Design a binder for this molecule. Structure first.
Ligand SMILES: *[C@@H]1O[C@H](CO)[C@@H](O)[C@H](O)[C@H]1NC(C)=O
Ligand SMILES: *[C@@H]1O[C@H](CO)[C@@H](O)[C@H](O)[C@H]1NC(C)=O
Ligand SMILES: *[C@@H]1O[C@H](CO)[C@@H](O)[C@H](O)[C@H]1NC(C)=O
Ligand SMILES: *[C@@H]1O[C@H](CO)[C@@H](O)[C@H](O)[C@H]1NC(C)=O
Ligand SMILES: *[C@@H]1O[C@H](CO)[C@@H](O)[C@H](O)[C@H]1NC(C)=O
Lengths: 348, 348, 348, 348, 348
């Protein structure tokens, strides 16, 4: 007659099989399932999610008579009776664990029990515009159903612990329905571009601008070839660091990688042209690559020195003319390309 | 009749259900719960904590008669009877582990048993003033309670193994109460700024000072543009290192990131101005960007050389005047900005 | 008479041994096995795979009479009866995991049950042409069979969730057969060379081309020896980065490592000869390594100055001639070597 | 009458409670416990240890009669009887694991069984003098004891597998007793200073010596400010590397961090002074920061050039003298500081 | 009479104790044990191994009568009877895993069953000659044996899956015997020096050669001190990277560390002497460290300029002589040291 006695008798019943008597169709209600994001990986595009759900089903064999047992509820260990397992079929490595060791059972057979599902979903995201990206990820929630025996799952509400999970920010988690009456959660993922814009795009933009203005350095004065090779080996490091953390899979791959490649090529070409111009200024032609008498001798020497200085000036001015032409052309194309690349990366 | 026989009888009773006889309300006492911090993550803002608690509850069915059994205590395996599970509902990934395989039971039904809860809590900390930051983190301690059946938790004292856990230092762990009679522990986390200030803030401040002094280098003499390009590509590396370990989530994001961005922009602007001044000094105008007779001829040559030297001096002096004006302007704005930025980062 | 009663009776049968009555030969059918790649490691050449299979076998003892029990199916817990374990013998660390806690059993003894095998396979791949590489990996699927008792496994179809797993791309998963009637899955792995070509090959090619054009810098003008030492010390970093992520095992090791080594050696040789040429130009020979009168005196001084300048010019032109000869030789040899190495790395 | 029959009957007795008949006091003997260190973490100051112990206790219920059963020993599974669990109360994450599945039981009740305890101990070591450091770490060995029931643990001998565990070297492991009759193991940890010395201290000392010598570089000749900026940025990198792997907790924090900070400050000050001196030499004053006639005119020009050359020589010599005075003072201070810091780091 | 009925009766026998009837001495035969290496760590010198063994023992109680049961073999679950646990006593963290959930038992009591042992062995390797190193590692295979009860292990053959495991290459795995009749496996580990020689030794060799040839750069011309300081801060990075992956334990520590230290010291000394020679050339003495009239005056100025240029030439030649003497010393000493160190690192 004790409530503990009722619990013990229910344990001794050993009902470790599901209530499949009614045509092997068990309606399982899961109201108020709470979703949370634990991490997001950008290189692998994999989402770690935690879903705390409240399963509520019916077990007719676990229903006593109220007259003999004057109680309305009883708490039993989870492993001493049957309990459904909830799966994330869409993702890999799904694991369901029990929040508590005890579950409540009412006098009419209703069973309430809270569970936690940790899942890893191979999310597909349109990462073409890094970092200005964001997309919707489906997460399937399913319970076992094979052939004739099918246990429908009825879901009511979803609550999301929305908040940044690192670089990525989870915006919403809504409940939608699939084609074959499959319930799933649509999770909206977005990228906070405040970090990538400052750490990646801004330094490269300033570096390209510095290269554009680097043509002010005179060829003869020096401090120009080293200045540009420093930029080149810095942009190579940038390319390596960018490649270390973005997926170069296939169609709609991130376009920042191609932009870095093109900027590196442009910088290398500019440095090459600068070095060739330096040689032209120094030598005067690009042939390196291709295979009272005492009072008179003094004015002869003086005019010889003057003529030498004049030739030095002329050969230092011709290369300056060529450098000016190339600088105008290069700066125009570089600015137009940078504007086009930004317009593509933000609105395409 | 032996104590081992009594223990075996209690094992054979198989009371694996909760002592829910008295209206399904079991008061669980947890006096002297010890808290310790294992790690703190600054980027993800996640706290790993270990709580060693001493649960002490009542099991009426596990109470023998003292006259037949002349003993006052008996130790039984934890898995052979019922035991409550303690949870950290506020945080993710909570696991409760049995410290020992045995528990003590008195003759009046009281059961003493110690447990260890390892939990990971998504801590919310105001990280605006990195590294001068510190805040209070709630850690909930809860046990299962559903519907009619509730088992209240009564907590008495908290002891903290206070000590640095890396960059972060745990200051205190007090016991407070929530709204709906929920017991929780408030943990005070603080940042030891001795490490971040030396490794991060001091080198950047000294580099900025070196940039402010860098204008002393003569434009014609060289060694100025490469000197600043080294600083710029070092500050880019500093920005990357800062972005690697700080959360750029949203409002009240760390201000050191914006400070590094602004310092980098100022350095790049100083470089551009210096390079333009170098071109102006070399060429004389910013048009590169914009599209007895023997005894007399020697005097002509000498005065021509003297005039050329005078022109060289004048073009090297005009750029010096412009550089001085820009240096005064830039140094005043830089000092005022650095003072304002430190004032913001310290007391805002 | 209840279906739950039938399930309980089958549970109480306790049939935890395999149906080996028929000559200890159990045919196990596994139709529609789905293969997916989780990760591929290039340095260790290890493949992580997940195989979701649908096992379907026969258990004669688990077959009831339809007249007494008017049902066609029943779902029982997986651990209450015997279930085969599927292994990946070819690879290491194979683990079979239960998809659900229930399995369906028909009235004639047929049992349907889904399993998930996670395996890690030591894959052998011809990585000579990094990154233009691709190969077929065998994955064995087997069940326990010792001596007289054998359980043949009959497979029907394989479905692959083809898609990039990082750097590597899985193309197909077909079903083939081994010699001794062993069923296995051939998985086609390919490398997306878009990432390695941009991050590794292109910067090195551009750096090498820059080294070839660096000979334009005059010996006296400076900015040349440092320009080359930066390239050499950057190529050392490239060699380290390349070594950090590629298996240098033995025969048919990646040839990009040898190519990087040879390019570094060539750059070092070019720098050495350039520095020797600089010394020759400065000193005039490679011996450092080897152990009216007033109106006339001015003419003498002017002639001495002119002769000194003439000697400087001649000693600066001889080294220019030597540098031109070496530049022609070096450029021709380096271009032919680069073309040959690319031809080897692409189509050999 | 079979030994296997005796083992089966002992198993069937189901003695899963501890031998608490004798006043609930069980003397547990653990002779010849072997200690080994698996790893030491310098940043977190956490010790990973493995202890292979040989527990030997008494179980009166597991004692048969020799006349009926003519045997002296029997081996039983560990899980079929009671076995004590050994804990490391001082440290976190203590786990006890059975070395074998079987244990030996004698005819008089004595039970021999070997166990392995893996523990993580939060070690407190005086790391002020990195790397010349070393200290004694206590490791508690304890078994469950609550209230009236206590089971004392009697230890005899400790043997340690001495050998370097990375940077740290374990020297000894002795057995001592605490205040409240608690047995513990004192482990002597020491740092092999050869690796940290050669990788951190010697390069920094050599860099500081190079900085002290760098004053020989002439102000006008160039190649000086780039040298010092390379030194300073390399020292900042060293500061970052040092901060990445040393605990900056509080009092008696490693003093190498302060030494690196002070040396960096000194280098920056030397750079600033050198740049200001260079400007003074170039300009002549620190005001940039503060807001027959033909035969005669040639003599005028020549004396003007001579005067200008003399002024250039004087303004170079004044800066040379100032640089000499600063060099003397700076080198004296630097040598005295380096010697004092070495003395503090080695013998304080 | 059914084979399944025979298996069920064997399961119901519940023989979970070792077959210890015959003097508690059980001969366990393990023929054809296969060894494989999973990973080798160079810094910690720890070997990860997988051993797939085929245990074959005798269980007299698990033997039926052939006349009543006309069968020769039967398959039983591994957990329903006794099974030995194979251990790796020499190494840490040994785990034995069941290859299958079933085992075969013959009519005469013989039991065949394969197991998998994963072990981690603290290997002792003579790493003095890195990378030209290689040594033999013992791996113990043992079963539980305490006091009177001893289970001998009889091993027949070992087959090894030879193949590179990263940097390390496993050559052989033979079976030997210890002193006290203990069976163990000797595994031959060797280092593929193709990777370390290319990534570590060769770049340092060319860097050293570049330092030796760097003396060609003239003192006055510049581009020398920066060239050497770049090499010095590159060699410091090499020292750090080498220290990151090699064990500096004690006697017979790798000599490449000492070699890198000595090369760095030599480079620093060469840089220091070059920087001193620069000042000697510029100033003329090492005292910085130590505390018709018109037609005639023009001749006076001209001869003064000539004398000044003559003094410049003489002071630029004396330092050249000193530099030549030092270079003749230094190149010979360094070449002899490099040859001696290579001879030591190869054949000592
Ligand atoms: C069982 O009783 C509970 C308690 O009110 C109620 O919520 C539930 O709907 C009932 N279920 C059925 C099938 O009557
Ligand atoms: C049971 O006895 C213990 C031992 O003194 C005591 O601490 C506890 O308060 C008692 N509980 C009750 C309900 O009497
Ligand atoms: C058992 O019945 C199922 C259901 O139709 C069928 O698919 C299967 O082939 C049958 N097996 C045998 C052996 O009759
Ligand atoms: C039991 O016998 C063993 C075997 O000699 C002995 O070592 C041990 O001391 C004995 N213990 C007692 C309590 O007699
Ligand atoms: C048992 O029979 C098997 C099968 O031939 C044989 O290999 C084994 O040696 C036999 N063992 C004994 C003890 O007879």
């Amino acid at each position: 007659t004790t409530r503990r006695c009722l619990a013990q008798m229910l344990i001794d019943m050993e009902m470790l099989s599901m209530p499949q008597d009614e045509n092997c169709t068990l309606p399982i209600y899961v109201p108020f399932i709470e979703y949370q994001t634990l991490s997001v990986n950008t290189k692998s595009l994999r989402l770690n999610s935690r879903l705390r759900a409240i399963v509520k089903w019916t077990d007719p064999q676990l229903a006593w008579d109220t007259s003999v047992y004057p109680y309305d509820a009883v708490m039993l260990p989870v492993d001493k009776i049957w309990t459904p397992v909830l799966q994330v079929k869409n993702g890999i490595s799904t694991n369901m664990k029990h929040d508590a060791n005890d579950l409540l059972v009412y006098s009419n057979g209703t069973v309430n029990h809270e569970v936690q599902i940790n899942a890893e979903i191979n999310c597909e995201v349109n990462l073409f515009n890094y970092p200005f990206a964001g997309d919707e990820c489906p997460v399937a929630i399913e319970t076992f159903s094979s052939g004739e025996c099918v246990t429908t799952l009825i879901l009511d509400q979803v609550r999301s612990l929305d908040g940044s999970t690192g670089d990525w920010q989870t915006t919403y988690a809504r409940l939608k329905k699939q084609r074959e009456d499959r319930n799933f959660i649509a999770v909206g993922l977005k990228i906070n571009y405040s970090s990538p814009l400052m750490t990646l795009l801004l330094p490269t933009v300033l570096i390209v601008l510095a290269d554009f203005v680097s043509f002010a350095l005179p060829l003869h004065g020096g401090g120009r070839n080293g200045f540009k090779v420093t930029l080149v080996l810095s942009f190579v490091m940038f390319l390596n660091l960018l490649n270390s953390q973005l997926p170069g899979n296939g169609d709609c791959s991130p376009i920042i990688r191609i932009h870095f490649c093109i900027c590196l090529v442009l910088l290398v070409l500019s440095m090459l042209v600068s070095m060739v111009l330096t040689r032209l200024a120094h030598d005067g032609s690009l042939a390196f690559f291709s295979p009272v008498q005492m009072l008179r001798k003094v004015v002869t020497f003086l005019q010889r020195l003057d003529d030498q200085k004049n030739q030095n000036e002329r050969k230092h001015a011709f290369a300056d003319k060529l450098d000016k032409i190339f600088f105008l052309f290069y700066v125009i194309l570089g600015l137009i390309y940078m504007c086009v690349m930004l317009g593509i990366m933000v609105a395409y």
